Coordinates of all heavy atoms in Angstrom, one line a residue:
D1 N 0.8 -1.2 0.0 CA 0.0 0.0 0.0 C 0.9 1.3 0.0 O 0.6 2.2 -0.8 CB -0.9 0.0 1.2 CG -1.8 -1.2 1.3 OD1 -1.3 -2.3 1.8 OD2 -3.0 -1.1 0.9
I2 N 1.8 1.3 0.9 CA 2.7 2.5 1.0 C 3.5 2.7 -0.3 O 3.7 3.9 -0.7 CB 3.7 2.3 2.2 CG1 2.9 2.3 3.5 CG2 4.7 3.4 2.2 CD1 3.7 1.8 4.7
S3 N 3.9 1.6 -0.9 CA 4.8 1.8 -2.1 C 4.1 2.5 -3.2 O 4.7 3.0 -4.2 CB 5.2 0.4 -2.6 OG 4.2 -0.2 -3.3
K4 N 2.7 2.6 -3.2 CA 2.0 3.1 -4.3 C 1.8 4.6 -4.2 O 1.2 5.3 -5.1 CB 0.7 2.4 -4.4 CG 0.9 1.1 -5.3 CD -0.2 0.1 -5.1 CE 0.2 -1.2 -5.9 NZ -0.8 -2.3 -5.6
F5 N 2.3 5.3 -3.1 CA 2.2 6.7 -2.9 C 3.6 7.3 -3.2 O 4.6 6.8 -2.7 CB 1.8 7.0 -1.5 CG 0.5 6.4 -1.1 CD1 0.3 5.7 0.1 CD2 -0.7 6.5 -1.9 CE1 -0.9 5.1 0.5 CE2 -1.9 5.9 -1.5 CZ -2.0 5.2 -0.4
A6 N 3.6 8.5 -3.9 CA 4.8 9.2 -4.2 C 5.5 9.6 -2.9 O 6.7 9.5 -2.8 CB 4.5 10.4 -5.0
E7 N 4.7 10.0 -1.9 CA 5.2 10.4 -0.6 C 5.4 9.2 0.3 O 5.9 9.4 1.5 CB 4.3 11.4 0.0 CG 4.2 12.7 -0.7 CD 2.9 13.5 -0.5 OE1 1.9 13.1 -1.0 OE2 3.0 14.6 0.1
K8 N 5.2 8.0 -0.1 CA 5.3 6.8 0.7 C 4.6 7.0 2.0 O 3.4 7.4 2.0 CB 6.8 6.5 0.9 CG 7.6 6.2 -0.4 CD 7.1 5.0 -1.1 CE 8.0 4.6 -2.4 NZ 7.7 5.4 -3.6
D9 N 5.1 6.6 3.1 CA 4.3 6.7 4.3 C 4.3 8.1 4.9 O 3.8 8.3 6.0 CB 4.8 5.6 5.4 CG 6.3 5.6 5.5 OD1 7.0 6.2 4.7 OD2 6.8 4.9 6.5
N10 N 4.9 9.0 4.2 CA 4.7 10.4 4.6 C 3.5 11.1 3.9 O 3.3 12.3 4.1 CB 6.0 11.2 4.3 CG 7.2 10.8 5.1 OD1 7.1 10.4 6.2 ND2 8.4 10.9 4.4
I11 N 2.7 10.3 3.2 CA 1.5 10.8 2.7 C 0.6 11.3 3.8 O 0.5 10.6 4.9 CB 0.8 9.8 1.8 CG1 -0.4 10.5 1.0 CG2 0.4 8.6 2.5 CD1 -0.8 9.8 -0.3
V12 N 0.0 12.4 3.7 CA -0.8 13.0 4.8 C -2.3 12.6 4.6 O -2.9 13.0 3.5 CB -0.7 14.5 4.8 CG1 -1.6 15.2 5.9 CG2 0.8 14.9 5.1
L13 N -2.9 12.0 5.6 CA -4.3 11.7 5.6 C -5.1 12.8 6.3 O -4.6 13.5 7.1 CB -4.5 10.4 6.4 CG -3.5 9.2 6.0 CD1 -3.6 8.0 6.9 CD2 -3.7 8.8 4.5
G14 N -6.3 12.9 5.8 CA -7.3 13.8 6.5 C -8.3 14.4 5.5 O -8.3 14.0 4.3
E15 N -9.1 15.3 6.0 CA -10.1 16.0 5.2 C -9.5 16.5 3.9 O -8.4 17.2 3.9 CB -10.8 17.1 5.9 CG -11.7 16.7 7.0 CD -12.2 17.9 7.8 OE1 -11.8 19.0 7.5 OE2 -13.0 17.6 8.8
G16 N -10.0 16.1 2.7 CA -9.4 16.4 1.5 C -8.3 15.5 1.0 O -7.7 15.7 0.0
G17 N -7.9 14.5 1.8 CA -6.8 13.6 1.5 C -7.3 12.5 0.6 O -8.4 12.5 0.1
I18 N -6.4 11.5 0.5 CA -6.7 10.3 -0.3 C -7.8 9.5 0.5 O -7.9 9.7 1.7 CB -5.5 9.5 -0.5 CG1 -4.9 9.1 0.8 CG2 -4.5 10.2 -1.4 CD1 -3.8 8.0 0.7
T19 N -8.5 8.7 -0.2 CA -9.4 7.8 0.4 C -8.8 6.4 0.6 O -8.3 5.8 -0.4 CB -10.7 7.7 -0.5 OG1 -11.2 9.0 -0.7 CG2 -11.7 6.8 0.2
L20 N -8.9 5.9 1.8 CA -8.4 4.5 2.1 C -9.6 3.6 2.2 O -10.6 4.0 2.7 CB -7.6 4.5 3.4 CG -6.4 5.4 3.5 CD1 -5.8 5.2 4.8 CD2 -5.3 4.9 2.4
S21 N -9.4 2.4 1.6 CA -10.5 1.4 1.7 C -10.7 0.9 3.2 O -9.8 1.2 4.0 CB -10.1 0.2 0.9 OG -9.1 -0.5 1.5
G22 N -11.8 0.3 3.5 CA -12.0 -0.3 4.8 C -10.9 -1.2 5.2 O -10.4 -1.1 6.4
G23 N -10.3 -2.0 4.3 CA -9.3 -2.9 4.6 C -7.9 -2.2 4.9 O -7.1 -2.7 5.7
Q24 N -7.6 -1.2 4.2 CA -6.4 -0.4 4.4 C -6.5 0.3 5.8 O -5.6 0.3 6.5 CB -6.2 0.7 3.3 CG -5.9 0.0 2.0 CD -5.8 1.1 0.9 OE1 -6.7 1.9 0.7 NE2 -4.7 1.0 0.1
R25 N -7.7 0.8 6.1 CA -7.9 1.4 7.4 C -7.8 0.4 8.6 O -7.2 0.7 9.6 CB -9.3 2.1 7.5 CG -9.6 3.3 6.7 CD -10.8 4.1 7.2 NE -12.0 3.2 7.6 CZ -12.9 2.9 6.7 NH1 -12.7 3.3 5.4 NH2 -13.9 2.1 7.0
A26 N -8.3 -0.8 8.3 CA -8.2 -1.8 9.4 C -6.7 -2.2 9.6 O -6.3 -2.3 10.8 CB -8.9 -3.1 9.0
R27 N -5.9 -2.3 8.6 CA -4.5 -2.7 8.8 C -3.7 -1.6 9.3 O -2.8 -1.8 10.1 CB -4.0 -3.2 7.4 CG -4.6 -4.6 7.1 CD -4.1 -5.1 5.8 NE -4.6 -4.4 4.6 CZ -3.8 -3.7 3.8 NH1 -2.5 -3.7 4.0 NH2 -4.3 -3.2 2.7
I28 N -4.0 -0.3 9.0 CA -3.3 0.8 9.7 C -3.7 0.8 11.1 O -2.8 1.1 12.0 CB -3.6 2.1 8.9 CG1 -3.0 2.1 7.6 CG2 -3.2 3.3 9.8 CD1 -3.5 3.3 6.7
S29 N -4.9 0.6 11.5 CA -5.4 0.7 12.9 C -4.8 -0.5 13.7 O -4.4 -0.3 14.8 CB -6.9 0.6 13.0 OG -7.5 1.7 12.3
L30 N -4.7 -1.7 13.1 CA -4.0 -2.8 13.7 C -2.5 -2.5 13.9 O -2.0 -2.7 15.0 CB -4.2 -4.0 12.9 CG -3.5 -5.3 13.5 CD1 -4.1 -5.6 14.8 CD2 -3.7 -6.4 12.4
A31 N -1.9 -1.9 12.9 CA -0.4 -1.6 13.0 C -0.2 -0.7 14.2 O 0.7 -0.9 15.0 CB 0.1 -0.9 11.7
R32 N -1.1 0.4 14.3 CA -0.9 1.3 15.4 C -1.1 0.7 16.8 O -0.3 0.9 17.7 CB -2.0 2.4 15.2 CG -2.1 3.5 16.3 CD -3.4 4.3 16.3 NE -3.7 4.9 15.0 CZ -4.8 4.6 14.3 NH1 -5.8 3.8 14.7 NH2 -5.0 5.2 13.1
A33 N -2.1 -0.2 16.9 CA -2.3 -0.9 18.2 C -1.1 -1.8 18.5 O -0.7 -2.0 19.6 CB -3.6 -1.6 18.2
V34 N -0.6 -2.5 17.5 CA 0.5 -3.6 17.7 C 1.8 -2.9 17.9 O 2.7 -3.4 18.7 CB 0.5 -4.6 16.6 CG1 1.8 -5.4 16.7 CG2 -0.8 -5.4 16.5
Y35 N 2.1 -1.8 17.3 CA 3.3 -1.0 17.4 C 3.6 -0.5 18.8 O 4.7 -0.6 19.3 CB 3.4 0.1 16.4 CG 4.6 0.9 16.6 CD1 5.8 0.6 15.9 CD2 4.7 2.0 17.4 CE1 7.0 1.3 16.1 CE2 5.8 2.8 17.6 CZ 7.0 2.4 16.9 OH 8.1 3.2 17.1
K36 N 2.5 0.0 19.4 CA 2.6 0.6 20.8 C 3.2 -0.5 21.7 O 2.9 -1.6 21.7 CB 1.2 1.0 21.3 CG 1.3 1.8 22.5 CD 2.0 3.1 22.2 CE 1.6 4.3 23.1 NZ 2.2 5.5 22.5
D37 N 4.2 0.0 22.5 CA 4.8 -0.8 23.5 C 3.9 -0.9 24.7 O 3.8 0.1 25.5 CB 6.2 -0.3 23.9 CG 6.7 -0.8 25.3 OD1 6.2 -1.9 25.7 OD2 7.5 -0.1 25.9
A38 N 3.1 -1.9 24.8 CA 2.0 -2.0 25.9 C 2.1 -3.3 26.7 O 2.8 -4.2 26.3 CB 0.6 -1.9 25.2
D39 N 1.4 -3.4 27.7 CA 1.4 -4.6 28.6 C 0.2 -5.5 28.2 O 0.3 -6.7 28.5 CB 1.3 -4.2 30.0 CG 2.5 -3.3 30.4 OD1 3.7 -3.7 30.1 OD2 2.3 -2.2 30.9
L40 N -0.8 -5.0 27.6 CA -2.0 -5.8 27.3 C -2.5 -5.3 25.9 O -2.7 -4.1 25.8 CB -3.1 -5.8 28.3 CG -4.4 -6.5 28.1 CD1 -4.1 -8.0 28.0 CD2 -5.4 -6.2 29.2
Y41 N -2.7 -6.2 25.0 CA -3.2 -5.8 23.7 C -4.7 -6.3 23.6 O -4.9 -7.5 23.8 CB -2.4 -6.4 22.6 CG -1.0 -5.7 22.6 CD1 0.0 -6.2 23.5 CD2 -0.7 -4.7 21.8 CE1 1.3 -5.6 23.6 CE2 0.6 -4.1 21.9 CZ 1.6 -4.6 22.7 OH 2.8 -4.0 22.8
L42 N -5.6 -5.4 23.3 CA -7.0 -5.7 23.2 C -7.4 -5.4 21.7 O -7.6 -4.3 21.3 CB -7.9 -4.8 24.1 CG -7.6 -4.9 25.6 CD1 -8.6 -4.0 26.3 CD2 -7.6 -6.3 26.1
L43 N -7.6 -6.5 21.0 CA -7.8 -6.5 19.6 C -9.2 -6.9 19.3 O -9.5 -8.1 19.2 CB -6.8 -7.4 18.9 CG -5.3 -7.1 19.1 CD1 -4.5 -8.2 18.4 CD2 -4.8 -5.7 18.9
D44 N -10.0 -5.9 19.0 CA -11.5 -6.2 18.9 C -11.8 -6.4 17.4 O -12.0 -5.4 16.6 CB -12.2 -5.0 19.5 CG -13.7 -5.3 19.7 OD1 -14.2 -6.4 19.3 OD2 -14.4 -4.5 20.3
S45 N -11.9 -7.6 16.9 CA -12.2 -7.9 15.6 C -11.5 -7.1 14.6 O -12.0 -6.4 13.8 CB -13.7 -7.7 15.4 OG -14.2 -8.6 14.4
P46 N -10.1 -7.2 14.6 CA -9.3 -6.3 13.8 C -9.2 -6.6 12.3 O -8.5 -5.9 11.6 CB -7.9 -6.5 14.5 CG -7.9 -7.9 14.9 CD -9.3 -8.2 15.3
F47 N -9.8 -7.7 11.9 CA -9.6 -8.1 10.5 C -10.8 -7.7 9.6 O -11.0 -8.3 8.6 CB -9.3 -9.6 10.4 CG -8.2 -10.1 11.3 CD1 -8.4 -11.0 12.3 CD2 -6.9 -9.5 11.1 CE1 -7.4 -11.4 13.1 CE2 -5.9 -9.9 12.0 CZ -6.1 -10.9 13.0
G48 N -11.5 -6.7 10.0 CA -12.6 -6.2 9.2 C -12.2 -5.9 7.8 O -11.1 -5.4 7.6

């Protein structure tokens, strides 16, 4: 996914930004949760 943007993972998301599919959003949200250095991971149906 990242490789397809000229700005790579520095592409800026937000109002007026690119549109991400549901599945791209799910995998970014999972990445964010798993990346955090935490003591307990609560993953609520993350493969939507």
Side-chain angles (χ1 to χ4, degrees):
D1 303 82
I2 296 167
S3 80
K4 276 160 188 173
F5 304 130
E7 294 156 289
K8 299 295 187 279
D9 46 351
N10 295 327
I11 191 157
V12 174
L13 314 173
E15 289 176 359
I18 61 169
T19 303
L20 296 178
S21 73
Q24 293 176 311
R25 290 199 316 272
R27 288 178 292 117
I28 291 168
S29 300
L30 181 64
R32 176 197 306 123
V34 167
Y35 175 88
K36 192 62 154 191
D37 160 26
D39 300 308
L40 178 64
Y41 295 81
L42 302 183
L43 302 181
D44 194 352
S45 208
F47 307 120

